[PDB]
Amino acid sequence: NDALNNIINNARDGCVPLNIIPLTTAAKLMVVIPDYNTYKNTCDGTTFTYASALWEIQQVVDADSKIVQLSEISMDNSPNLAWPLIVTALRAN
Amino acid sequence: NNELSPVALRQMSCAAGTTQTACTDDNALAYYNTTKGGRFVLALLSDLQDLKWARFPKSDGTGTIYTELEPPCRFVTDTPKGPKVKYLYFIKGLNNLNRGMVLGSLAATVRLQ
Amino acid sequence: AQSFLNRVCGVSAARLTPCGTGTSTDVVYRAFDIYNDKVAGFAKFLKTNCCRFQEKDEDDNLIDSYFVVKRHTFSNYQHEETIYNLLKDCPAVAKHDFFKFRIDGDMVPHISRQRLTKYTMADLVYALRHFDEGNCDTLKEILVTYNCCDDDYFNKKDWYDFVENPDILRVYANLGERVRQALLKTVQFCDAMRNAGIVGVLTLDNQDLNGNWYDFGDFIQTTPGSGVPVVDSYYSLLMPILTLTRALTAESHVDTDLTKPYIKWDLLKYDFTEERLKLFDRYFKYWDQTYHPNCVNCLDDRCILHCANFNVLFSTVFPPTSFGPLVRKIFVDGVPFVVSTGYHFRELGVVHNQDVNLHSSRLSFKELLVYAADPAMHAASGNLLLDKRTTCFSVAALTNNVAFQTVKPGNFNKDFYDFAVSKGFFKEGSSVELKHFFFAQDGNAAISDYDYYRYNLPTMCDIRQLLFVVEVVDKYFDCYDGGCINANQVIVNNLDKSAGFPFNKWGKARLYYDSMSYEDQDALFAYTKRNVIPTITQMNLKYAISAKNRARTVAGVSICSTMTNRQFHQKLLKSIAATRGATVVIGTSKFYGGWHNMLKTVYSDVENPHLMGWDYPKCDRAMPNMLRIMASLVLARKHTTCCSLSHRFYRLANECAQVLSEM
Amino acid sequence: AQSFLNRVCGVSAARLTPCGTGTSTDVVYRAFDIYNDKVAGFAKFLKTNCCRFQEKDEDDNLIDSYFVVKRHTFSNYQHEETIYNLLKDCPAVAKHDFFKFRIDGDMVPHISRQRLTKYTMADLVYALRHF
Amino acid sequence: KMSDVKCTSVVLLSVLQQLRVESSSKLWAQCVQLHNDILLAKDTTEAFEKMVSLLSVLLSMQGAVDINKLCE
Ligand SMILES: [Zn+2]
Numbered sequence A: 001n002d003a004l005n006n007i008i009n010n011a012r013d014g015c016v017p018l019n020i021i022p023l024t025t026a027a028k029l030m031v032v033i034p035d036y037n038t039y040k041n042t043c044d045g046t047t048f049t050y051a052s053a054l055w056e057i058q059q060v061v062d063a064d065s066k067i068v069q070l071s072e073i074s075m076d077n078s079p080n081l082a083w084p085l086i087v088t089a090l091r092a093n
Numbered sequence B: 001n002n003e004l005s006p007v008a009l010r011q012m013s014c015a016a017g018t019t020q021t022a023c024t025d026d027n028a029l030a031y032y033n034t035t036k037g038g039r040f041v042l043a044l045l046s047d048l049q050d051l052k053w054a055r056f057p058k059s060d061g062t063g064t065i066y067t068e069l070e071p072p073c074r075f076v077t078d079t080p081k082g083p084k085v086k087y088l089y090f091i092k093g094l095n096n097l098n099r100g101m102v103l104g105s106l107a108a109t110v111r112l113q
Numbered sequence C: 001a002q003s004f005l006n007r008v009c010g011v012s013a014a015r016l017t018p019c020g021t022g023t024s025t026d027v028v029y030r031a032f033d034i035y036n037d038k039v040a041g042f043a044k045f046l047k048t049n050c051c052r053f054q055e056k057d058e059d060d061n062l063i064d065s066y067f068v069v070k071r072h073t074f075s076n077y078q079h080e081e082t083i084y085n086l087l088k089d090c091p092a093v094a095k096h097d098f099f100k101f102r103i104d105g106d107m108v109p110h111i112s113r114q115r116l117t118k119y120t121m122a123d124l125v126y127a128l129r130h131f132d133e134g135n136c137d138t139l140k141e142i143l144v145t146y147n148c149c150d151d152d153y154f155n156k157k158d159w160y161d162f163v164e165n166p167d168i169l170r171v172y173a174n175l176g177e178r179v180r181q182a183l184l185k186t187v188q189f190c191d192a193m194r195n196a197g198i199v200g201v202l203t204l205d206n207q208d209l210n211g212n213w214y215d216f217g218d219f220i221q222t223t224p225g226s227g228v229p230v231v232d233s234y235y236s237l238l239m240p241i242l243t244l245t246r247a248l249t250a251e252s253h254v255d256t257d258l259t260k261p262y263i264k265w266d267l268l269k270y271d272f273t274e275e276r277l278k279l280f281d282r283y284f285k286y287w288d289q290t291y292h293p294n295c296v297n298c299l300d301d302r303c304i305l306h307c308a309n310f311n312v313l314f315s316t317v318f319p320p321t322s323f324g325p326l327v328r329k330i331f332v333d334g335v336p337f338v339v340s341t342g343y344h345f346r347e348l349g350v351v352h353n354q355d356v357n358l359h360s361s362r363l364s365f366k367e368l369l370v371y372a373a374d375p376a377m378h379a380a381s382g383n384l385l386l387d388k389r390t391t392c393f394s395v396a397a398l399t400n401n402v403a404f405q406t407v408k409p410g411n412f413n414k415d416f417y418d419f420a421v422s423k424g425f426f427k428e429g430s431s432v433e434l435k436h437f438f439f440a441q442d443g444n445a446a447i448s449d450y451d452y453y454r455y456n457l458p459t460m461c462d463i464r465q466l467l468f469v470v471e472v473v474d475k476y477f478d479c480y481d482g483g484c485i486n487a488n489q490v491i492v493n494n495l496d497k498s499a500g501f502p503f504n505k506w507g508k509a510r511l512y513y514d515s516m517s518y519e520d521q522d523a524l525f526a527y528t529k530r531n532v533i534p535t536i537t538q539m540n541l542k543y544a545i546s547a548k549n550r551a552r553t554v555a556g557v558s559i560c561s562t563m564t565n566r567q568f569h570q571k572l573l574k575s576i577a578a579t580r581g582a583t584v585v586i587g588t589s590k591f592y593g594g595w596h597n598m599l600k601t602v603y604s605d606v607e608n609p610h611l612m613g614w615d616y617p618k619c620d621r622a623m624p625n626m627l628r629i630m631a632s633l634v635l636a637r638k639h640t641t642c643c644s645l646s647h648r649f650y651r652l653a654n655e656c657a658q659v660l661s662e663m
Numbered sequence D: 001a002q003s004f005l006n007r008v009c010g011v012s013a014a015r016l017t018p019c020g021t022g023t024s025t026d027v028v029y030r031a032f033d034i035y036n037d038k039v040a041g042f043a044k045f046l047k048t049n050c051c052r053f054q055e056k057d058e059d060d061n062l063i064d065s066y067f068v069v070k071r072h073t074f075s076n077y078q079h080e081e082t083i084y085n086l087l088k089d090c091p092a093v094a095k096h097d098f099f100k101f102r103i104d105g106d107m108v109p110h111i112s113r114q115r116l117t118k119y120t121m122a123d124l125v126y127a128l129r130h131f
Numbered sequence E: 001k002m003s004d005v006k007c008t009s010v011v012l013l014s015v016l017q018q019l020r021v022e023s024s025s026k027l028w029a030q031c032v033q034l035h036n037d038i039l040l041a042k043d044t045t046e047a048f049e050k051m052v053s054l055l056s057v058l059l060s061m062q063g064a065v066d067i068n069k070l071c072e
C-alpha cells in the first residue's frame, strides 16, 4: 500500500522494528477467544477498538469453522459451541 | 566489621619525567604492590609539578616501563621546615580499591596540615 | 536504672520501652559481610553488644523503629564522633548521638542511633539468597511488616513456590519501591562522602531498610573533594534482588511517580542508547568499570557478559514491540522489497548488518535462501492476530484460519498381552504392572504447551561470582580441540529429516544439502560471520510412550541455522564425544563394561564417599538468558586462532537471534 | 495467629504476653549438664526450641512466671504423655499440657509447661561456680 | 483385571478415532478426557462407570452394526 511507504518515510533512518509493521498497516484482524467471559470484555457489539484503531466484525466461526451468528453468542447458549471462537474483522477509517 | 587494608606496601625512589625521555632518574616516589608476578607499582609521589611518564625497569630489569600518569594530586604535607607541597601521581586506569589502599597507606604514614 | 532510658531518649520525645532487660546488651542472629585479615565471607554471625529499645506509638501500641545503643573503645568513640561531625548533613545518614554514662565507677562510652529498623539490607538479601522453606521466618516477618501480604496467607500451603502459586511474584514485587529508595540514598551518601574527603568500604549490613546509613567504623581522612567510596561487594551482592523484586518498574511512569500513567513511547523509536546511559548514571554512578550499551563495542568476552548483565536489567523498562528484527525497504530490479538489516537484542543492544546493498539486479541461490528464510516478508504480508489463549507476545497470522492439531492414541498388541497373562503376569497388587501408555490429546494441545514459557523471567546475575565460575567451568573443558572446518569435512547422519519452515514445502534436508556446492556453503558461513539472519522455528508434537499425560513438543530449526552451526561447532563436539574418562560422559557406550568403567571413574578416590543426584524442574523452559549466553561463550572459547574478534561476536549474535528469542 | 497465644493459655487466667516475637521459637543462652555418648560436660549451650510467654499480673505489670512450649517428635510426645500420666500426682512436678496445632498443613506436636521461672538451678550453680 | 479395562479403553478410543469422530470438536474433547481419566484410575468401579459413559458414544451412532458382531 501507500501506508507502508508512509511509515517508512516517517522514520529518521528508514529502518523500523518488525513488530509494528502489521500492527500499523494490517487490514484484517483475527481474534481467538477461549470462553464467553473473555468475549464480553473485548469483542462486544459489531464494532470494537484495538491497537488504538477501530474495527468492525465481519464473520465469526468456531473450532470446526462453521459460521456463527452474533445472535447466539449469548451467556446461556454459550455451552453449546465449540469454544475457541475466531473473529475476523476489518480496519475502520 | 569490614576492614579495608590488612596489609599495605613499601616505598621506592625511581625515575620519572614529562615525556618518555624527559624521564631523568632518581626523582620519583613509587608505591608498589609487590605481587606474585613482580613488583607492581600503583602511585607516584613527587614535588615536581607534573610528569606524564615514569620509567622503571621490568621485574627482570629488561625494559624500563613507560607508564603514563594521572594529573598530580595537590596537598601540603608538613615537616620541621614548615609547609611542604607534594604531588601524588596515580597510574591512569586504577580501580577505586587501589586508590583507597594507596590513600590509606599514605595518609596513615605521612602528616598533612 | 531508668535514668538510662531517660538519657537515651535524648530530646526526641519518645515513649520508649526497653527490650534487652534492664541495662544489659542483647543477643541476636544477624547476617554480616566480614573481611578482616583472618576470616572472610558473608554469613550469619551472633551480634551481642547492643541495648535495643523499641520505640512506642500513641495509644501504647508498638511501632517498628528502634533505638540502638552500642559501647566500645574510647578511641572508637572519638573516631565515630569526628567522622559523624564531618558527614552530619546528607539525609542518607542516621542521626547518631554520643554521650557517656556510669554503671558503677565507669564513665563508659555509648553511641546511640535514632529511629532505625529491625533488619538491615544484608538480612533481606541473605534471606532471599539462602532460602529454605523449613525456617523462612525472618522473611515472613519482613513481608508481613511492610504490608506486602498478611499473615493468613502463609497457611496457603505452597505459598513460596514459583511454578505453583505464581502470585508470589506480585507479593515479592511489592518491595520494589523501598529497594529503589535504598539505591537513591546510597548514591546521595557516595556523593557526600566524596565531597567531604573520606575513604571507606561500603557494605550491606550498615543500612536500615529505609536507606539511612550508619556505622563509620573504619573510615579515614583525606583532603576534601578527593574521597573514594568503594561499592563493589554492595552492588555485586544486591544485584539479583533488583530483578526478583522488579525494582525499576517506577521508571516507566510519566515521571517515576507510581500514580501517573505510562509514558507513551512512539512506535518507531528503537535506539534507546542515551536512556540506558542516563539510567546507569542515575542508579549506579560510582560503579568503577566502563559500560557500553551496545555490546558491539565490547573488548573481550568478559566485557560482553559485564555489559549484557546491565542490559538485561534496563531492558525491562522499554516497550516490548521495539525488539526484534529491524527491517528496511530495498529495491531489486525495480521491485521494492522488505528485508531485515539488523536486530535489537534484549542483551546486546543494537546490531547492524555490514553487507547490505540497495538496488540489485539478480539474486543467486545464496541470497534467495537468506531472503526466503527471514520472517520479514512472512510477517509483513500477513493479518494481524490477537491470541488470548496465551500471554506471550503475538505477531501475525499467516493464513486465514488457525489449525488445531490433535494426537491419536496408540495401538494394541493383543497376542503379547494374552501371552503375558497366560504365563502369570499382571497380578493384582503386584509390583510390575502397566504404567506407560500412549496418552491422547485434544485440539488446543500445541498452544497449551507452548504457553509454558511464562515461567521464563528476566534474571540479573551476581556479576562477580559469575565471572569467576565461568573461569572454573572453562577449566573443566581444556582437553579438547575446536575451530572452524570447511564444508567438505562435516558429517551428517540421516540426510533425510525435515528442513524446518518454509523450506519443508519443497523437500527434506537432502535437497538443500545436495543442491548447494561447497562454494555456496562456505560463502554462507563467511556471510554469517559478518551479518545477522533471523529465522523461524516450527513447533512439532511428539508421539511416543510416556507416564505423564502432558503433551511434549520439540522445535525444528530451519536449515539456514544448522547448515552453519555445524561448521562452527562440529570439531569440538566430536572431540568431546570421543574422549574417555572425562567429566562429561557423552558418547561413552554403556555396553561391554562401559557402565563399570564410568562408575569406577566417577568413584575415583574421594575420602568418605556418599552419592547424590538432583533434578531441575522445567529445565528447558526456565533457563535464564544469561547462563545460555555464558554457555555459548564457553563453547566458542576454542576459537582463538581461526576467527578474529568481530567474527566471534557476530557468531554469538547469530546464535542468539536464531535459538534464544526468535519467532 | 493469636491462636497460639490463646489456645495455649488453656484455662488459667488469660493474662499472657508473647515475649516471643511471634509464633516462632526463641534463642537464649543457658547452662546445661550434658552426657550423651559423644559430648559430655557442664557448660553454657544455646537452647533454641521454645516459645516463651511471659505471664502478666493485674494492673498490666509484669510478673516472673512464664509458660514454655516445646515442639519435637511425635514419639517424644507420646513418651512424655504416658510418663506424665504416671507421675501426675506429687506436687514436685510442673503441670504439663499436651496438644497439637497446625501452622500450615501440619498437625504438629506441642508440649506446654505452666508457670515456670526464668532460670533453673543449673543457671544459679553455674553463675556461682564460674564467676 | 483393571489392566483389562485400561486395555479395552485404548482399543475403543482407537475405533472411535478411526470412525472420524475427531472431525467434530467438543465430542472428541470429551472422549479424550474420559480415556485419559480411565488410564490413570486406581479402583475398578469408577473406571467401569467411565467406561460405560464412554461406550455410550459409540452406541449413539449408526456406523457400527452391532447386531452383526453380536453373533458370537
Ligand atoms: Zn563492554
Ligand SMILES: [Zn+2]
Binding pocket: C483, C484, C639, C642, C643
Ligand atoms: Zn572460527
